[PDB]
Design an enzyme around this catalytic site. Structure first.
Site, PDB file in Angstrom:
ATOM      1  N   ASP A 232       1.112  -1.439  -0.003  1.00 23.72           N
ATOM      2  CA  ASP A 232       0.279   0.010  -0.144  1.00 23.72           C
ATOM      3  C   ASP A 232       0.883   1.343  -0.359  1.00 23.72           C
ATOM      4  OD1 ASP A 232      -2.953  -1.106   2.461  1.00 23.72           O
ATOM      5  OD2 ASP A 232      -2.701  -1.381   0.310  1.00 23.72           O
ATOM      6  N   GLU A 503     -14.831  -1.222   5.020  1.00 22.38           N
ATOM      7  CA  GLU A 503     -14.903  -1.725   3.198  1.00 22.38           C
ATOM      8  C   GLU A 503     -16.026  -1.688   3.225  1.00 22.38           C
ATOM      9  OE1 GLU A 503      -9.735  -2.246   1.982  1.00 22.38           O
ATOM     10  OE2 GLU A 503     -11.080  -4.095   2.903  1.00 22.38           O
ATOM     11  N   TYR A 615      -8.511  -9.763  -2.423  1.00 22.75           N
ATOM     12  CA  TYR A 615      -9.909  -8.618  -2.593  1.00 22.75           C
ATOM     13  C   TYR A 615     -10.711  -8.857  -4.404  1.00 22.75           C
ATOM     14  CZ  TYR A 615      -8.582  -4.573   0.266  1.00 22.75           C
ATOM     15  OH  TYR A 615      -8.433  -4.240   1.174  1.00 22.75           O
TER      16      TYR A 615
HETATM   17  O1  LIG Z   1      -6.141  -4.913   3.919  1.00 26.18           O
HETATM   18  S1  LIG Z   1      -5.370  -4.456   3.109  1.00 26.18           S
HETATM   19  O2  LIG Z   1      -3.376  -4.602   3.908  1.00 26.18           O
HETATM   20  O3  LIG Z   1      -5.385  -5.308   2.053  1.00 26.18           O
HETATM   21  C1  LIG Z   1      -5.648  -3.262   2.272  1.00 26.18           C
HETATM   22  C2  LIG Z   1      -5.994  -1.773   3.011  1.00 26.18           C
HETATM   23  N1  LIG Z   1      -5.159  -0.564   2.822  1.00 26.18           N
HETATM   24  C3  LIG Z   1      -5.663   0.285   3.004  1.00 26.18           C
HETATM   25  C4  LIG Z   1      -5.089   2.215   2.961  1.00 26.18           C
HETATM   26  C5  LIG Z   1      -5.927   2.633   2.255  1.00 26.18           C
HETATM   27  C6  LIG Z   1      -5.522   4.361   0.823  1.00 26.18           C
HETATM   28  C7  LIG Z   1      -4.727   4.681   1.727  1.00 26.18           C
HETATM   29  C8  LIG Z   1      -3.335   3.294   2.452  1.00 26.18           C
HETATM   30  F1  LIG Z   1      -2.049   3.538   2.487  1.00 26.18           F
HETATM   31  C9  LIG Z   1      -3.924   2.055   2.596  1.00 26.18           C
END
Ligand SMILES: O=S(=O)(O)CCNCc1cccc(F)c1
Length: 658
Positions: A232, A503, A615
């Site tokens: 991310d 989400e 996802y």
């Molecule tokens: O559940 S996961 O770790 O796979 C993905 C979550 N990402 C959230 C997120 C959303 C926006 C900006 C970020 F830096 C991170």
């Protein structure tokens, strides 16, 4: 070159098959290719498909093997105790097990190239590893090889790594066949790729798929094009889109919906070893988590995504600052100038950069693309490229100038280091996208913005209302527009979690009635309901019958157009597992019109319970088939980072599900 050995229809039922007589005296020279078509829909935890070994006492570590795990991982071992070589190359999440309940024929190509000292593995037309070594070990040059084996490796006269499965075809060649020749080998894939390594995005990785069926029948997809591995933000990530005009059969070359230019778009093989895999592009701006909706009134397609300034992710984003300042009624983007220790500027009307200390306008303006102009003249910054040539990640100037953007590290004027939401529109159903606009703050001056829920927004069928779900600490924050996305208002819905990655995706059960399904921290998917087109929301309930992990996974959902068993139907896409992101399912729910309760009647297993599924995106294709674009791997697991071509697309019919 034709094969030196070719065989087929071998049943591996926890008993090895000896092919030594047929194969060993055929092996010649130092380079070899193995082509194998195989099924394993009920694999053992760890099993060898093919082995070449020294079966003699005292040489148990002298063998070559192609092995797989019940996680879907594929690999080889190449071992010789005398030479002191123990090579182990592998990649998680490389296999299919079942599709529509039938065992999938995987096509495996392994190339052992003595000239380039390189071992390369392809599965289902995807290169899953390519490893160069200083000291090459030819696979039949292992000291004392005396057995060729299917479905085990013979070590000291005993069967190790016994397999359950079948090998429908196996061929060996005394040559390292080229990447071109490999491309000509017929495949029997159950899936397609929309986005892939080497395409127009030049990202080697992809995450966070979306799908949306447009009124014209065109099916649109968006995704995170992730450059710095699968991490991310902070990273470099662009939002890419592709569409299909033939019910998902073929897809257009991707274009970008949202992109930054401060770092080069580079196709990089991100390191997967434990010392370096957490390397992260640390100075690039990025976009992350896209969502799509279509507006009937204007006909426009609208895409939103989160926006992250240089070096920013959800971990370090300034909570307590929206990045905007209120001036009596209105919200203006704050800016900090090179050398100042505070944010003394705002972007007022017409992009005019304004000094809050002296209430004086400047000679600087911010254009539509959030680029900095001085007296109408475009300022520039030097672009960065990344490399691991030094042995660690290096981010450095590459000599190219690009327009100066306020989201960049090198910009004269910089935005607040926090998360934003941007919107872009298309007037041609995804053939091109507008320059993005930032959405205003919704929860006040001193609250960092909410996080967009990836996937689809909701276009209510009986009105012009558009809704995008977002999440923040303690609530879902629905963004609502009745004017084709020109203006937005929020509708807040409390949830009993602090700090959840909540989400959320929505379905319209019937006119004005919205059910939202969302990720929680409880191991159960939750839901809430609105009966007034999103103005007010019910309390939170939970679905029994599906399990998620403690950390949870994005869930996608649609309202199916046709009745099933005489009932209104909703389809949910999610992993079904309390252990990891695996066991992907489509779950068909029938609505009880007495009370709008849902009976989750059918569970369709997308692949094996042990194979990865994270996802996902689901849509009803114009022909009433179901399209699914999904992360076919565990995108949480710290063992499955930085995999290429694992976001894959399949086509299903409702009769497959039920
Ligand atoms: O559940 S996961 O770790 O796979 C993905 C979550 N990402 C959230 C997120 C959303 C926006 C900006 C970020 F830096 C991170």
């Amino acid at each position: 070159i034709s094969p030196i050995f070719q065989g087929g229809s071998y049943q591996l039922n926890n008993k090895s098959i000896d092919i030594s007589s047929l194969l060993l005296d055929k092996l010649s020279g130092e380079s070899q290719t193995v082509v194998m078509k195989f099924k394993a829909d009920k694999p053992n935890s760890l099993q060898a498909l093919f082995g070449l070994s020294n079966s003699k006492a005292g040489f148990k570590n002298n063998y070559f093997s192609i092995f797989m795990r019940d996680s879907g991982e594929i690999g080889v071992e190449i071992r010789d105790a005398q030479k002191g070589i123990n090579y182990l190359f592998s990649r998680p999440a490389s296999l299919w097990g079942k599709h529509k309940g039938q065992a999938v024929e995987n096509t495996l190509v392994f190339v052992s190239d003595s000239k380039d000292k390189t071992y390369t593995m392809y599965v289902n037309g995807i290169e899953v590893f390519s490893e160069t070594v200083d000291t090459f070990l030819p696979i039949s040059n292992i000291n004392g090889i005396d057995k060729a084996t299917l479905g085990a490796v013979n070590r000291e006269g005993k069967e190790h790594y016994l397999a359950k499965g079948s090998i429908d075809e196996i061929s060996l060649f005394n040559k390292a066949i080229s990447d071109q020749e490999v491309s000509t080998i017929p495949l029997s894939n159950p899936f397609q790729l929309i986005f892939q390594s080497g395409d127009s995005t030049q990202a080697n990785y992809f995450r966070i798929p979306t799908l949306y069926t447009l009124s014209s029948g065109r099916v649109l997809s968006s995704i995170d094009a992730r450059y710095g591995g699968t991490h991310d933000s902070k990273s470099k990530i662009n939002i890419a889109t592709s569409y299909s005009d033939d019910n998902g059969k073929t897809w257009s070359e991707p274009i970008f919906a949202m992109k930054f230019n401060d770092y080069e778009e580079q196709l990089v093989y991100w390191p997967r070893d434990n010392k370096l895999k957490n390397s992260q592009i640390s100075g690039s701006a990025s976009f992350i988590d896209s969502s799509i909706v279509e507006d009937k009134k204007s006909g426009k397609t609208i895409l939103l995504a989160d926006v992250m300034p240089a070096g920013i992710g959800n971990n370090n984003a300034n909570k307590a600052d929206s990045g905007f300042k209120e001036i009596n009624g209105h919200y203006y983007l704050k800016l900090k100038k090179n050398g100042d220790n505070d944010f003394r500027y705002t972007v007022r009307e017409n992009g005019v950069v304004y000094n809050e200390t002296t209430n004086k306008p400047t000679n600087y303006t911010i254009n539509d693309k959030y680029e900095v102009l001085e007296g109408g003249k475009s300022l520039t910054v030097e672009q960065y490229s990344v490399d691991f040539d030094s042995g660690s990640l290096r981010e450095r100037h590459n000599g190219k100038q690009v327009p100066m953007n306020v989201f960049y590290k090198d910009s004269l004027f910089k935005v607040t280091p926090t998360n934003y939401i941007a919107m872009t529109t298309s007037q041609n159903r995804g053939e091109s996208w507008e320059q993005f606009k930032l959405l205003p703050p919704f929860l006040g001056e001193k609250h960092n913005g909410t996080y967009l829920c990836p996937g689809q927004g909701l276009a209510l069928k009986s009105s012009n209302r558009l809704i995008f779900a977002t999440y923040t600490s303690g609530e879902l924050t629905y963004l609502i527009s009745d004017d084709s996305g020109q203006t937005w208002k929020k509708s807040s819905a409390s949830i009993p979690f602090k700090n959840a990655t909540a989400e959320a995706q929505m379905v319209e059960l019937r006119d004005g009635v919205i059910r939202t399904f969302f990720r929680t921290t409880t191991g159960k998917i939750a839901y809430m309901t609105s009966r007034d087109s999103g103005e007010t929301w019910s309390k939170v309930s939970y679905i029994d019958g599906i399990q998620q992990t403690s950390y949870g996974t994005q869930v996608s959902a649609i309202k199916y157009s046709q009745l099933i068993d005489g009932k209104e139907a909703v389809i949910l896409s999610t992993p079904n597992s309390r252990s990891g992101r695996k066991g992907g399912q489509l779950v068909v729910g029938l609505v009880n019109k007495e009370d709008d309760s849902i009976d989750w009647k059918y569970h369709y297993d997308i692949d094996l319970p042990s194979y990865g599924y994270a996802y996902s995106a689901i849509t009803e294709l114009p022909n009433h088939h179901i399209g699914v674009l999904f992360e076919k791997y565990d995108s949480w697991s710290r063992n499955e980072l930085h995999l290429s071509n694992v976001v894959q697309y399949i086509d299903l019919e409702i009769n497959d599900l039920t």
